[PDB]
Amino acid sequence: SKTFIQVX
Amino acid sequence: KNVLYRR
């Protein structure tokens, strides 16, 4: 269970 | 850290 948030 | 931030 992983979440990847793209920041710039 | 289950939430990883991708620069």
Side-chain angles (χ1 to χ4, degrees):
Chain A
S1 309
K2 302 174 180 293
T3 304
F4 293 97
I5 300 177
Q6 193 73 31
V7 184
Chain B
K1 298 179 182 177
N2 53 90
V3 177
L4 289 81
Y5 299 91
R6 293 184 170 160
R7 175 183 61 239

